Amino acid sequence: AVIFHEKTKEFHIFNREVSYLMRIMENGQLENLYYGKVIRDKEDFGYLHEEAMRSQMSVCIPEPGILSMQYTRQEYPVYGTGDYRSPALTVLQENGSRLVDFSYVSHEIYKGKKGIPPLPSTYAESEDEAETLEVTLHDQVTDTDLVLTYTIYEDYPVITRNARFEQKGEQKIVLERAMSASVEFLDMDYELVQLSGAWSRERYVKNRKLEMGIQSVHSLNGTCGGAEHNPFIALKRPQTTENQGEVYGFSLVYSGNFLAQAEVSTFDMTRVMLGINPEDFSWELNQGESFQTPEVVMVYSDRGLNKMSQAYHRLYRTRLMRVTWRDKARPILLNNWEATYFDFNEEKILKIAEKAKEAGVELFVLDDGWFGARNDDYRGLGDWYVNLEKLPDGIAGLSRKVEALGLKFGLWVELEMVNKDSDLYRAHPDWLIGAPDRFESHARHQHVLDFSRKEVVDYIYKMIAKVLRESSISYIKWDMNRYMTEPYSRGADASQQGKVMHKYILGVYDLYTRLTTEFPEILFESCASGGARFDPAMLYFAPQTWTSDDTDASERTKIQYGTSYVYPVVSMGSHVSAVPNHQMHRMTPIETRANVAYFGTFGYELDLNLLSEAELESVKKQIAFMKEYRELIQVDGDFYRLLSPFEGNETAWMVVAQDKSRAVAAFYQRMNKVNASWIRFKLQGLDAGTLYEVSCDMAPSMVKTYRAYGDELMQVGIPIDREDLNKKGGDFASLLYTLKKV
Amino acid sequence: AVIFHEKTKEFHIFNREVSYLMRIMENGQLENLYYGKVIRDKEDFGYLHEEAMRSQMSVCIPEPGILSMQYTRQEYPVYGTGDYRSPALTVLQENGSRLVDFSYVSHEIYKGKKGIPPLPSTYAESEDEAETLEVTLHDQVTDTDLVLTYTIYEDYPVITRNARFEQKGEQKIVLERAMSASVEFLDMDYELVQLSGAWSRERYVKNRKLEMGIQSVHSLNGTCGGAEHNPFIALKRPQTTENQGEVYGFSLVYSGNFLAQAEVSTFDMTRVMLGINPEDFSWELNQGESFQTPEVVMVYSDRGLNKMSQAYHRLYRTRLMRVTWRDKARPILLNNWEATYFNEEKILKIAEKAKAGVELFVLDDGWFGARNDDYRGLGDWYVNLEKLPDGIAGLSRKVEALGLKFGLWVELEMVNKDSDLYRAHPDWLIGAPDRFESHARHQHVLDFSRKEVVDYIYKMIAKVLSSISYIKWDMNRYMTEPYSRGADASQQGKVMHKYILGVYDLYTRLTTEFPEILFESCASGGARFDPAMLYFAPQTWTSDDTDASERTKIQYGTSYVYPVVSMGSHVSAVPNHQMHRMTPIETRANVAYFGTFGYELDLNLLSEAELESVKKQIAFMKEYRELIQVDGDFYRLLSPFEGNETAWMVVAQDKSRAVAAFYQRMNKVNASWIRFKLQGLDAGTLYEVSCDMAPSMVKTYRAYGDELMQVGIPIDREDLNKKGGDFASLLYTLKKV
Amino acid sequence: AVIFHEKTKEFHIFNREVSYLMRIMENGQLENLYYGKVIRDKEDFGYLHEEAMRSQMSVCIPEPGILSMQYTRQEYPVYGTGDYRSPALTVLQENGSRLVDFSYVSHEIYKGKKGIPPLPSTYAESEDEAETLEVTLHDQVTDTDLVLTYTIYEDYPVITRNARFEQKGEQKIVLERAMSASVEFLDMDYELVQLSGAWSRERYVKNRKLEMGIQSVHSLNGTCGGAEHNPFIALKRPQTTENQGEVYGFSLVY
Amino acid sequence: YDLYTRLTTEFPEILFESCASGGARFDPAMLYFAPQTWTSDDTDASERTKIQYGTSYVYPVVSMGSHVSAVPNHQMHRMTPIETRANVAYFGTFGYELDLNLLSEAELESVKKQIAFMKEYRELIQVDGDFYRLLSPFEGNETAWMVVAQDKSRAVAAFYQRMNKVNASWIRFKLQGLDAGTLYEVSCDMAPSMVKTYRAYGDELMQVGIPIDREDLNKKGGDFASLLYTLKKV
């Protein structure tokens, strides 16, 4: 509950777990007085905020008082009044100046969380799920108005922050830089945690030690956040493992360019900011206009990384996903991409679907190569009508046939790229992104379409709506395969060019808002050559994402471990692939592929009419196993990480029911060893005092079962023979253990 | 030399200890192939470029080719054409686009070194010490021109780089960011070093390990380079301490805002960049206008930190400082700051009593206008007559008669609200309409970006300059509210750089008029200690802390890039006014020797025992000054960091003399046997180590050069109790038999 | 309390904080199963032991068995019967041999704490404050008795150990090594703590990471323990601080 | 052992102290006849600061013998403020080892109030109290102990310094041992070589701590100084 003490001008933000503290300075600026574990509310916290005299210290109050911003923890810093660190805001007037001074005016208080129109954010279904405060600041040299919002969630240790700007004078301004968050700490004995990777290597967990200077991650891709750095930042004490210790986590809800920075000054202070990347960003507000910035979610944990990740999972799964697909399971599908690629026909698709129906697959998805020419990857992408020479009947015929068989239908789309061999290039050549006399940049022989303008979006919607309505698709895979280059918009004036790379992202949002409204029964999945656009946004639109194009059980273990720090289990896509890998060219048991793909959205990518009888009855059995444990793995249960692919060659996962009545756990190893030490496998998150029946199957490439109390598996753990792992394949073995309360 | 292979289109610039190699791409853009230890010449080095097909890769040549700037090692990068990292050059055209396509035209090779017009740099004295390559690049969409200049020295493994822009068309462009140099490698197994600290804590050594992302040091101060971060970074292998290993060092010749960053991508590739901070910098070239960027000096050593620092010292003492003071050794002075904080006879007895052996005297602030406090007028540069009834000329002569010399103290670009100039020119400050002005130390900052203020100050200062032989120029503030009143909206991004240029030109005038005065820089205790200003002032007041145990660390940190002669050190009273610690005279003198020697105490209120200790040490300095400063190679032996001892040693250039020191901080009981391994002697030469082991007798034996390297010099923990307890130090003199 | 399972021959020692499990092997020797946080009692816990087949492994039982000492957690090791690690007991016989093999005979349980007569030790006032277990091992070729004592306190996670020797035979045996206790685990992720110093620098704390081999502190002074090494030792997890983590402490009363 | 045995069995009303050239025989076996031991012949505050920290892992605070020595030290040859010596010597067995005829009432009035303080708090420091170590003399130059009562109604803290820092950072002194919610009165003595007193809840002192000024540590010995805090329930 937010509380205001009038005499001292303090704002207290606190629920049962976290606590915040602010104060009005001698100016109209705010200060940070505390951020962390909850404390008892007491008035006059003013003995905090010490101050003293130092050499060459520039102050910004009248003659007898000295107060420099260099030595105080401000909320929304500026540069030009005495602070020589990095700023967070920058404004240009008509005098050529960049000097601003926002002062406090008033505040508003209420309950529940409101919405920010142009951008997606979390919500609150009831009026008693959150509480919010709004602080307003005014400027007098230029009639600018600034608003800062603070939301606290009840029953969850999360605080949400954003900002807003309004112009109500008669002078135009330029916003060259405007971050979304800024939080400051006194000491520096922290470590920085980030997720860094690349194509088929996304989101590896990396640690750094804080030092004097600046340390940052950023993206300059324009179209997406890219595969290199993921918009998520953590601070953790060096003595904080996954079962205990303190940690702060910051996550940004936005899908384009971003910057996350931590600066440590010489006097040991730390400052962290998250927001848009001010590379080529310059908004150009006039009278009566406005500007809203993406929001940031902050989580504090006092018990290790698992608690913070679980809070992120539950919030993103309940209060961010859409109501329709929030608390429902996910289907088992089959994709024919890797099985046939560009070469296929109607009857081949029917044969594959007929075999898959016998196996038990629930729906069939048709991949690239059903439109335009599509002989190679050089031909028409803007032509979104069915090919007739290669499919004589059309999409409606295939949909009705595969519905008669007993399966559901789905399609693949890439709605924002065009080729030099499409109809739109000859029709409307000047609908691309580029500038005069500038060389075009080709990636996979394709170019990027200009969604800065509504005219192109209407044209794309006209075809997508009419191809979806005259057919029975219930699953759409939206794709993306390019990075943006030469950001120029040929439908804007010379003074509106600093919004292009931003407005493009907006164009990609509202199109979704159309398709998900007209068609509310279609399930969506975002994909960008793997996990290149995988972020807290688009969980508002597409409740699952294709994690990577790797599909290797020896690699997806490491990728999912790194990915599961902030994102829930339900939204991570995963598939079972052919035995000789197209990426590593490795060999892997079917058992371990099934074990790895269980945690996520189960599926298939191979051809089911090409295997052997023993390797097919196992497919049927694992489909049944997923059909049984799907709702425990996905809808009801908390994720726990036990061992890590980093600093080792073993991995271990587990999900437990909320009432501690069921659990499934897994053990994986990467290489093999002889004469090795004994193994004890220690579990987590169970209930001590409950007699659990641990079961496992040890069929080579019989079933063991024994009863043990909750605490014994906690401290002692299950013993694992290294000969059993050598009869389940040596290099990449794995063992799935199931528990029940009886 | 510099060699061009025209059939393969490659540049090779080699030395006796370093080589650089570049190649003109299939475009008109430059790629780096090698930068390191010298390599043998050869034609067709073209197999060192590697291209692969990868997903999400943007190509910038026609369709049947692949070349992506995000996987290449380029020289002056640009954003928005397939490269997705932080660029080096940004420009805003009238269309609103920030896209350019600079391409190659031609080049020129000439021996010698040309001067940068509005900026200071190094120099050569004959067409036999350096050879320069200039490469011209041209943009066609905008009629712009670019130049890159690389200079290679002889007898030193140093390479200098700088760029230049020239607009030669009809349109107008705006340079929103323009660095000086960018360097790329293939590996990320390095460590970044930096010199960080604060007031009275200057330049501590700090090491950081590179990890995927960005790590940097910045400066937003307008007036000076700051006491927090210095313009010097270096990359070292993890196994390199002082005597073996590789290290690269980069240094920037500039005095204002800077940025120095290292960025490592996800494919194990490092780019390092230096230059002016692009925070509020936006230069606005019109037709026919030009822009020059500050120089960058790079040094490479395969022996370690000592070789790199000894190259830096010998380069900055021989080809940077002015010729007149290039040989002469610095004198011993006495300042009165600590003795009296703010009076003629009192500054005439001190002069005579110091005339002990002191060579000259200098007057501190408080001799002008009112200046009864730190509240009165700095804008008045005429002599106060209440304190000095005879002015300055009478005081100067009554001091110069005895044999001493004279020097004064000035602070030329700060103004107080209680001055004559503020009553005569209230709009001559720095500030903006409707905004509050920050007050620091009850003084404000003038506007050197204009010209009439420089002249107005120059007339007054040139008038008062008596029989002066030494001037101390001080600065005591940071810059806030950076807005000018003699400009319009189109030129408000040039104020902070024109401030530095207007600081430089006053130095130029005052030095050119009076070439017989020794200047010493000071910025509230060395907050402007940078490779610039050695062009003008050959020494600087490194810090105000003046404590032996603290200077033991600050001087070790500073000695990474800067020489010894330029490090101003003094001797202060016993209970030091900052830390409030006790320390004997002998160790204070031992600390103060290395550098330029001086004094900051009264000599009265000093007992008879110490007054004879301060005539013997002045005699020692008068004999070893020319070895310590002019002819000597510095060696760092033990670090105050990473331990609890310190050791320096200066050697002569033909291996004939040496002076060594050993400092310790806290006393130790039941400790271990100490050895003292020297560095830089000649193995096949006997010597005669000698240390006066007095209380608070001399041991003088003879031993070969290698015995004093592999074995060491035994030190007795009992000899460390006679010469005080904590903060006890020893001094050694070695001379060939 | 103190519990013995007749069917499986296990001893369970526990209070509200700590827990200790012991089993009698197929020989008379005692083996370790668990030492740590408290557990709920269960009738049997045999699988906690593990045995496999390796190369160059020596067996101490008739041929069908595969039991080996080099790969077991034993409570009082001896050398020359299969183990190639540092022993904790050594004797010399009139024949000049060094080999012994003590086997389980009997055990006794009671409430309280008897004190070793010639040496100082801790005590207890009431009879509910501690509980004691004595295990007797006998040697046959040399009529010798070994008595191992285990005491658990209450309200404190403290367990006390010692060993006593008796000679009821007729010949002469020479004790050339006899330690007081030996505790063995299954993993090596620990740091060792010690207190080292000298005159007027006594007991400076030092930490050292465990590595394959032997690390040991010692005193050879004769008149006193000495200022160099204090008779103490502690094993801690790497992530252990003053307020969180796991640690074991061993203190010797001598 | 049997010499100790007979000597203590014949005379049971005597206190026997054990010393081996400065605590070279400090073992759990020498505390069943002699209940206290002379820790070290250094007696220097800046050295006993580190020595007692290492000692306190296994032996109680009562057995640690402490003394106040001559201010020009005989082992380290160092000058230290008198209140710091007292503060370091409190956490053990108090006592002096100097002549009380070589001091001024300006130094000997402090002794008459140090003795009063120790006589007031010795039943809390020695008999009934749990020892918490907060900061370590290793990896840094700050030390902090603390004593709390089992009733969790009173406590005593201590903060120590080795060197002095100029233009340094801020200081929050976090302590543990108290209870979650219980209003506490915190006091401190302020002399230039008078009394601060505020109130705070138990958890504020733990997560947030106690503010420390660096000019209030540069008045009680610049290079070497120490602070003492008393906490009472009320």
Three-class HEC string of A678-730: CCEECCCCCCCCCEEEEEEECCCCCEEEEEEEHHHHHHCCEECCCCHHHCCCC
Measure the CA–CA gap between C19 and C159, rounded to whole angstroms: 10
- From A154, A461, A165, select the one nearest A289 (Cα to Cα): A165
Report how far apart the first and last C-alpha atoms of chain B are (Å, whole number): 43
Amino acid occupying residue A250: F
Report the length, in residues, of chain A.
742
**Is B667:B645 a contact under the CB 8 Å cutoff?**
no
SS3 A357: helix
**DSSP per residue, A252-265:** E--SS-EEEEEEE-
- Report yes or no: D67 at the C interface, CB cutoff 8 Å: no
**Is B423:B392 a contact under the CB 8 Å cutoff?**
no
D1–C253: do the CB atoms touch at under 8 Å?
Answer: no
C36–A715: do the CB atoms touch at under 8 Å?
Answer: yes
- From B473, B492, B476, B474, select the one nearest B484 (Cα to Cα): B492
Amino acid occupying residue B334: L
* Cβ-based neighbour number of residue C12 at 10 Å: 19
Residues 6+ apart with CB under 8 A from D40: C200, C202, D22, D23, D47, D48, D51
- Report yes or no: D164 at the B interface, CB cutoff 8 Å: yes
Decide if B544 is catalytic: yes
Residue-wise burial string across B138-163, b where 16 or more C-beta atoms lie within 10 A, e elsewhere: bbebbebbbbbbbbbbeebbbbbbbb
Q: Which residue has the tokens 């997406």?
A: A224
Token readout for A723 is 């000969």
Which alpha helices (DSSP H) does B254-392 contain, by range? 305-318, 346-354
- Characterize the bridge pairing of strands A333-335 and A363-365: parallel
Closest CB to D24 among C205, C224, C253: C224
Measure the CA–CA gap between C67 and C69, rounded to whole angstroms: 7
**Is A123:A263 a contact under the CB 8 Å cutoff?**
no
Measure the CA–CA gap between B56 and B266, rounded to whole angstroms: 14
Measure the CA–CA gap between C151 and C104, rounded to whole angstroms: 19
Binding residues of D: 19, 41
Report how far apart the first and last C-alpha atoms of chain C are (Å, whole number): 28
- Characterize the bridge pairing of strands A89-92 and A30-37: unpaired
Measure the CA–CA gap between B125 and B322, rounded to whole angstroms: 12
Method: cryo-EM
Token readout for A205 is 């967990």
Beta strands in B585-651 (DSSP E): 598-599, 633-638, 645-651
- Contacts with D53 from chain C: Cβ below 8 Å: 205
* Cβ-based neighbour number of residue B608 at 10 Å: 7
Token readout for B275 is 């230059």
SS3 A429: helix
**Is A263:A281 a contact under the CB 8 Å cutoff?**
no
**Is B408:B472 a contact under the CB 8 Å cutoff?**
yes
C40–A680: do the CB atoms touch at under 8 Å?
Answer: no
CA distance A153 to chain D (A): 22
Measure the CA–CA gap between A130 and A141, rounded to whole angstroms: 36
**DSSP per residue, A243-290:** TBB-EEEEEE--SS-EEEEEEE-TTS-EEEEEE---SS--B---TT-E
Binding residues of C for substrate: 199
SS3 B507: helix
- CA B131 to chain CA centroid, Å, is 25
User: CA separation (Å) from A513 to A117, A411, B390, B525?
Assistant: 12, 19, 87, 62
Angle, helices A346-359 vs A395-405, to 10°: value is 20
**Is B203:B333 a contact under the CB 8 Å cutoff?**
no
Measure the CA–CA gap between B342 and B375, rounded to whole angstroms: 13
Residues 6+ apart with CB under 8 A from B415: B378, B379, B421, B422, B428, B429, B443, B444, B445, B446
- Characterize the bridge pairing of strands A174-185 and A89-92: antiparallel
SS3 B465: coil
Measure the CA–CA gap between C201 and B564, rounded to whole angstroms: 39
Measure the CA–CA gap between B82 and A438, rounded to whole angstroms: 13
A214–B214: do the CB atoms touch at under 8 Å?
Answer: yes
**Is C238:C191 a contact under the CB 8 Å cutoff?**
yes
A723–C52: do the CB atoms touch at under 8 Å?
Answer: yes
Residue-wise burial string across A142-163, b where 16 or more C-beta atoms lie within 10 A, e elsewhere: bebbbbbbbbbbeebbbbbbbb
**Is A623:A360 a contact under the CB 8 Å cutoff?**
yes
- Contacts with A40 from chain D: Cβ below 8 Å: 181, 201, 203-204
**Quick one: DSSP state of residue B710?**
I
Angle ∠(B81,B86,B88) on CA atoms, nearest 5: 85
Measure the CA–CA gap between B537 and A332, rounded to whole angstroms: 78
**Quick one: DSSP state of residue A359?**
H
Measure the CA–CA gap between A224 and A508, rounded to whole angstroms: 11
**Is B59:A443 a contact under the CB 8 Å cutoff?**
yes
C230–D51: do the CB atoms touch at under 8 Å?
Answer: no
Token readout for B298 is 């790079």
Mutate to test the interface with C, among D2, D18, D25 (most CBs of C within 10 A): D25
Q: Which residue has the tokens 């005495």?
A: A82
Dihedral (CA of A147, A152, A157, A160) sign: negative
What are phi and psi for residue B472, nearest 5 degrees?
-115, 115
**Is B275:B294 a contact under the CB 8 Å cutoff?**
yes
Token readout for D94 is 């108090």
Measure the CA–CA gap between A346 and C93, rounded to whole angstroms: 91
- Characterize the bridge pairing of strands B130-138 and B144-153: antiparallel
CA distance B498 to chain A (A): 16
What are phi and psi for residue A553, nearest 5 degrees?
-65, -30
Amino acid occupying residue B484: S
User: CA separation (Å) from B193 to A696, A738, B265, C230?
Assistant: 54, 52, 19, 41
Residues 6+ apart with CB under 8 A from B479: B221, B222, B223, B430, B445, B496, B499
Token readout for A545 is 């994402």
When computed from its CA atoms, the radius of gyration of chain D, rounded to whole angstroms, is 19
SS3 letters for chain D? CHHHHHHHHHCCCCCCEECCCCCCCCCCCCCCCCCEEECCCCCCHHHHHHHHHHHCCCCCCCCEECCECCCCCCCCCCCCCHHHHHHHHHCCECCECCCCCCCCHHHHHHHHHHHHHHHHHHHHHHHCCEEEEEECCCCCCEEEEEEECCCCCEEEEEEEECCCCCCCCCEEECCCCCCCCCCEEEEEECCCCCEEEEEECHHHHHHHCEEECCCCCCCCCCCCCEEEEEEECC
Closest CB to D77 among B199, B201, B725: B725
**Quick one: DSSP state of residue A498?**
G
User: CA separation (Å) from A458 to A43, A382, A450, A467?
Assistant: 57, 13, 12, 14
Measure the CA–CA gap between D42 and D20, rounded to whole angstroms: 14
* Numbers of helices and strands, H then E, in chain A: 11, 35
- CA A211 to chain CA centroid, Å, is 28
- From A86, A149, D140, select the one nearest B216 (Cα to Cα): A86
Beta strands in A397-553 (DSSP E): 408-413, 417-418, 447-448, 473-478, 523-526
What are phi and psi for residue B296, nearest 5 degrees?
-130, 135
When computed from its CA atoms, the radius of gyration of chain C, rounded to whole angstroms, is 20
For residue B222, count CB atoms less than 10 angstroms from its CB and return exposed for 0-12, middle for 13-18, buried for 19 or more: buried
Residues 6+ apart with CB under 8 A from B442: B374, B375, B416, B417
- Characterize the bridge pairing of strands D195-200 and D184-189: antiparallel
**Is C131:C1 a contact under the CB 8 Å cutoff?**
yes
A313 membership: H or E segment, kind and range:
helix A305-318
Closest CB to D176 among C225, C230, C243: C243
Measure the CA–CA gap between B552 and B647, rounded to whole angstroms: 9
SS3 letters for B646-676? EEEEEECCCCCEEEEEEEECCCCCCCCCECC
From B544, B547, B602, B633, active-site residue: B544
SS3 A50: coil
What are phi and psi for residue B69, nearest 5 degrees?
-65, -15
Measure the CA–CA gap between B326 and B482, rounded to whole angstroms: 38
From B380, B474, B530, B602, active-site residue: B474
Measure the CA–CA gap between C222 and B649, rounded to whole angstroms: 48
- From B498, B96, B92, select the one nearest B284 (Cα to Cα): B92
**DSSP per residue, C110-144:** EES-PPPTTS-----SSSSSEEEEEEEEEETTTTE
Measure the CA–CA gap between B583 and B665, rounded to whole angstroms: 11
- CA B491 to chain CA centroid, Å, is 30
Amino acid occupying residue B600: E
**Is A439:B59 a contact under the CB 8 Å cutoff?**
no
* Cβ-based neighbour number of residue A532 at 10 Å: 28
**Quick one: DSSP state of residue B715?**
B
Cβ-Cβ contacts under 8 Å between C and D: the total is 78
Measure the CA–CA gap between A121 and B497, rounded to whole angstroms: 43
- Classify the phi-psi angles of A378: left when phi > 0, otherwise alpha if psi is within -120 to 50, otherwise beta: alpha
Measure the CA–CA gap between D75 and C202, rounded to whole angstroms: 14
Report how far apart the first and last C-alpha atoms of chain A are (Å, whole number): 43
Q: Which residue has the tokens 């009063």?
A: D116
Token readout for A644 is 């890590």
**Is C17:C36 a contact under the CB 8 Å cutoff?**
no
Angle ∠(D189,D121,D38) on CA atoms, nearest 5: 110
* Cβ-based neighbour number of residue A371 at 10 Å: 22
Measure the CA–CA gap between D186 and D233, rounded to whole angstroms: 9
**Is B32:B73 a contact under the CB 8 Å cutoff?**
yes
Closest CB to A709 among C40, C55, C244: C40
From A101, A549, A697, A731, active-site residue: A549
SS3 A220: coil
Residue-wise burial string across B462-498, b where 16 or more C-beta atoms lie within 10 A, e elsewhere: eebbbebbbbbbbbbbbbbbbbbeebeeebbbbbbbb
- Report yes or no: B698 at the C interface, CB cutoff 8 Å: no
Token readout for B625 is 């000054």
